[PDB]
């Protein structure tokens, strides 16, 4: 109901091809052309040279299973630094005497 629009949204891309698998918590923004075989590419599309980034088709008419989902991943890591973020507290009534 938000991202998908009539005509398609090409702003969101993804990396289809990479020479190996990424390490945990690694971000690679490199646009370098992926080389499948031994044929030199040098940034020019051609035989065994493919542009890695591909587009997500976004329209409201697509099926429910393939509808894009916005995913928010919270990374919880406990380091040796002093703890700060904590859960919410609760305040009760005050009584005297």
């Amino acid at each position: 109901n938000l991202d998908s629009k009539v005509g398609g949204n090409y702003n969101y891309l993804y990396r289809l091809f990479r020479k190996s698998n990424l390490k945990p918590f690694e971000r690679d923004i490199s646009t370098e052309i992926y080389q499948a075989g031994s044929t030199p590419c040098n940034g020019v599309k051609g035989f065994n040279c493919y542009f890695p980034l591909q587009s997500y088709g976004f329209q409201p008419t697509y099926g429910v299973g393939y509808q894009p989902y916005r995913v928010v991943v919270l990374s919880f890591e406990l380091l040796h630094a002093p703890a700060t973020v904590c859960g919410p507290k609760k305040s009760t009534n005050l009584v005297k005497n």
């Binding site: 289809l16 091809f17 499948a36 075989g37 065994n48 493919y50 591909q54 088709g57």
Partner: peptide, 24 residues
Amino acid sequence: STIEEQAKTFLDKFNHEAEDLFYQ
């Protein structure tokens, strides 16, 4: 280095492009 790796790479990218144009 093998042709199977080069053929599978061509088929992995072709399935995405052919699916986008066939829908439109």
